[PDB]
């Protein structure tokens, strides 16, 4: 079986539980994850961004299949959402999609949950071990049937024209640790 | 008070207890610390090197002042040694010195403990927080009087001509975590 993902305290990361997802590297690159709109006058729609000032907002992982031990494991497709309320008309779940002002594929909100065909895989992410203590990266490469529209890639930070730290699909990966919220 | 140094399990690092001192970064940069000679036919004297293949050899920190709670704290001068036996006629304690064949100041064996003579400060190291989870660097800059011979600097890894991974004083710092050997 794939290895369990562990949190910063070495305990298994679990589905249905709030975690902060926080940069493993401190300083300029430090910060957890939150949401923000395009960055100009429009408030909506939202994408996933890095907050440089704090550990960000709580995130919950949801399993695709029934996972009886409730443990999140390496390189298994899963769903991701922020456990917060927002004022845009969309879910708080992550997906890969086009986002205005950003070339390429962005991690946005408005994601779906579960498998129900090709497009639902655009809401599936994998968590893989990275090269720092207790650290992981997000990777997009679903193992469920889908079209070839979105190429497989790691998730990393990209500074947009407003210097908002967007998460996008790209060759390199951002390293994160998981910190149980409570 | 300064914060405790913590080990990879988040427990305070203690004086007089064995730890492996292991690279925070995996892959090519991975491995703990051990000792090796100048790299040619001579076995002696020894310097501190990174073993790329495993967590290395056990290391013990010793306090310079009396530390009642026995906890190693950030930015406090301390002594470092390997808790191993060697076949060179020197102590297993770390110090900064010139080492045969290596340009600049190297972390070698043959160190002293405590504070008798200005030379003994060349065996004093500080552990400072680095920018990765549970990660730290060694910094040489003693807080006790000494000669101006050895400049303050961080400790990092340098591949010598044999590709032996020497620890030297330099601007950049190698990030390490501490793993209790009885774990
Ligand atoms: C998701 O966020 C919710 C909204 O913050 C959390 O529920 C809230 O938890 C508060 C304590 O942190 C408590 O005041 C509120 O009563 C509660 N609000 C509602 C509408 O339930 C929720 O936190 C979890 O669920 C509740 C029932 C408590 O057991 C918390 O300790 C749990 O963390 C967050 N997480 C989940 C998985 O829903
Ligand atoms: C320093 O290294 C010594 C030599 O390896 C350790 O002592 C040895 O520990 C062995 C168990 O790992 C035990 O078989 C040997 O009897 C013992 N050898 C001698 C000469 O004592 C020492 O380990 C600590 O002390 C011993 C007595 C046990 O209590 C161990 O559990 C301790 O870790 C190493 N550490 C120190 C602080 O001396
Ligand atoms: Co070895
Ligand atoms: Co005297
Ligand atoms: N916004
Ligand atoms: N040697
Ligand atoms: N001296």
Query: What does the block give as tokens for A10?
Result: 């070495």
Domain count, chain B: 1
CA distance B86 to A38: 63
- The CATH code of the domain that includes A95 is 2.80.10.50
Strands (E), A24-68: 32-36, 47-51, 59-63
3-state secondary structure of A26: coil
Which residues lie near ion ligand 3 (Cβ < 5 Å)? B 51, 53-54
Both tokens of B11, joined, read 């427990």
Spatial distance between the Cα atoms of B50 and B24, rounded to a whole number of angstroms: 12
Tell me, yes or no, if A9 comes closer than 8 A to chain B by beta carbon: yes
Ligand 2 probe mutation, B83, B180, B181, B182, most atoms within 8 A of CB? B83
Determine the distance in angstroms separating the CA of A135 from the nearest CA of chain B, rounded to an integer. Answer: 8
A12 and A181 Cβ atoms separated by less than 8 Å = no
Sign of CA dihedral B158, B135, A25, B3: negative
Is residue A79 within 8 Å of residue A93, measured between CB atoms? yes
Ligand 2 centroid vs B85 CA: distance in angstroms? Answer: 12
Would you list the DSSP string of B80-146? EEESS--SSSS-SB-EEEEETTEEEEEEES----SSSSGGGGGG-BEEEE-SSTT-EEEEE--SS--
* Nearest CA-CA partner of A106 in A30, A22, A164, A19: A164
Contacts of A27 in chain B (CB under 8 A): 131
Nearest to A134 among B27, B29, B133 (CB): B133
CA A31 to chain centre: 14
Contact with chain A for residue B24, Cβ under 8 A = yes
Domain with A13 in it: 1-182
| Helix, strand, coil fractions of chain B, as percent rounded to 5 | 5, 40, 55
- The ligand minimizing its distance to the Cα of B34 is 3
Q: Alpha-carbon distance A101 to B112, whole Å?
A: 61
Considering only CB atoms, B131 lies closest to which of A8, A27, A134, namely: A27
How far is Cα A26 from Cα A5, in angstroms, rounded to an integer?
21
Q: Do A41 and A30 meet the contact criterion of CB atoms below 8 Å apart?
A: no
CA gap A80, A122 in Å, rounded? 11
C-alpha to C-alpha distance for B142 and B161, rounded to whole angstroms: 30
Give CA–CA dist A93/A76, Å, rounded. 17
B133 touches chain A (CB under 8 A): yes
DSSP for residue A27? G
What is the spatial distance between Cα B12 and Cα B104, in angstroms, rounded to a whole number? Answer: 33
B139 vs B77: CA distance, rounded Å: 9
Give contacts of A135 with chain B, Cβ < 8 Å. 133
Q: Are the C-beta atoms of residues A35 and A49 closer than 8 Å to each other?
A: yes
Burial class (CB in 10 A: 0-12, 13-18, 19+), A15: middle
Contacts of B106 (CB under 8 A, 6+ apart): B47, B96, B97, B98, B99, B166, B167, B168, B169
Residue among A37, A50, A48, A17 nearest A89 (CA)? A37
Rounded CA separation B41/A63 (Å): 59
Half-sphere exposure of A75 (CA within 13 A, CB side): 7
Round to whole Å and give the CA distance between A101 and B154.
Answer: 43
Resolution (A): 1.7
How far is A150 from B38, CA to CA, in rounded Å? Answer: 53
Name the nearest CA neighbour of A79 among A48, A105, A114: A114
Method: X-ray
CB pair distance less than 8 Å for A24 and B133: yes
What's the rounded Cα separation, in Å, for the pair B76 and B141?
A: 10
Q: What SS3 class is residue A6?
A: strand
Q: Which pairing describes strands A32-36 and A153-159: parallel, antiparallel, or unpaired?
A: unpaired
d(CA A143, CA A76) in angstroms, rounded, equals: 8
What number of H helices and E strands is found in chain A?
Answer: 0, 12
């Amino acid at each position: 079986a794939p290895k369990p993902i562990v949190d910063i305290d070495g305990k298994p990361v679990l589905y249905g539980v709030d975690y902060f997802v926080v940069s493993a590297i401190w300083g300029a690159g430090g910060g957890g994850l939150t949401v923000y709109g395009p960055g100009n006058k429009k408030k909506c729609p939202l994408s996933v961004v890095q907050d440089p000032f704090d550990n960000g907002e709580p995130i919950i992982f949801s399993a695709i299949k029934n996972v009886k031990d409730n443990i999140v494991r390496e390189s298994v497709d899963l769903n991701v959402k922020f456990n917060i309320t927002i004022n845009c008309n969309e879910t708080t779940a992550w997906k890969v999609d086009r986002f205005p002002g950003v070339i390429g594929w962005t991690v946005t909100l408005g994601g779906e949950k579960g498998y129900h065909g090709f497009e639902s895989t655009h809401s599936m992410f994998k968590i893989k071990k990275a090269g720092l203590p207790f650290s992981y990266k997000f990777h997009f490469c679903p193992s469920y049937p889908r079209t070839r529209l979105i190429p497989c890639n790691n998730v990393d930070i990209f500074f947009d024209k407003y210097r908002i730290r967007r998460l996008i699909l790209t060759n390199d990966a951002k390293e994160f640790v998981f910190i149980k919220t409570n």
